[PDB]
Amino acid sequence: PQLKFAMQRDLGIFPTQLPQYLQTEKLARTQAAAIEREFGAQFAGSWIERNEDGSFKLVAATSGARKSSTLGGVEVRNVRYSLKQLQSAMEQLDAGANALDGVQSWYVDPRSNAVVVKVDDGATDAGVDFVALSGADSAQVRIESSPGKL
Amino acid sequence: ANIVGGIEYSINNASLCSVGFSVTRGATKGFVTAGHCGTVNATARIGGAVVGTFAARVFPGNDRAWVSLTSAQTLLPRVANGSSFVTVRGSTEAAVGAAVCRSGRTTGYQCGTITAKNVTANYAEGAVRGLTQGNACMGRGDSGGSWITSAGQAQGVASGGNVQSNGNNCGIPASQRSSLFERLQPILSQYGLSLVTG
């Protein structure tokens, strides 16, 4: 009820769109492990995504050639790097920081098939030096400017 | 006092934070919140009255803590939302892209979606790993506050974010927000706590 207002106000989810969204949220939860099991070593993550028309969908990425899934309701997206590859780059970044003015945060981002390094507006250079010293493959990492400060 | 997620509490009469969730450790009452909110033994007050003390905390590295309360406190399975509240039904973690909302004494009840998991934040005090990022806005004071789904599944407690000079990131589009929270289950597991549900 009072949550519907917030959902419509902050997420643009109108009452009639609630059921389909909920069905997708549940599907993402119930099928997560099954999707990972199916894509094997080439698994590249899964997430709930909103379509331009307002509907929601479950997307699963793979670094393989697979173009479909045995489980229904799953859109397969072909990407370059596997989750394992991105996770390795992520660990390198953690290690680099463990031994960073301007760098806000970093994380594996399956939706963009890359490890994201957020930096304060105007600190991209700091992000560049960080990635370089970390020894992370620059092709697997993407620097993104972020307003404000952590 | 009534222990509800999202309400304000003070630490050592010096700083402010928001209650995460009512929990129990056997017969002991308590609530989880952010580690950066207080050091072990720090005194927690609600409405000016002492309600408990920080029993344990980890920050940086992680950003978690729980306050052991006096038997007089009233634990409720809720998270504040305006004049009403959201009932806490469980702690099932939602997927990336799932709609989630947070409650705190500064910005109140705000919603967005989970945008990333296992995030390492470069906080001034030191890095904190394993955080979840969402795009609901937040502000100074909301820290330690509840993050929960629409169906009442507790997700975690507010850890930090890219706030602006005004103290919050509600002034920028959700697409540019980095609102981070510490996952709930690892806190419950590390301290042997059970989430109060309804």
Ligand SMILES: *S(=O)(=O)c1ccc(CCN)cc1
């Ligand atoms: S708290 O976890 O909500 C939070 C909010 C704002 C700050 C300042 C960040 N520069 C820290 C923590």
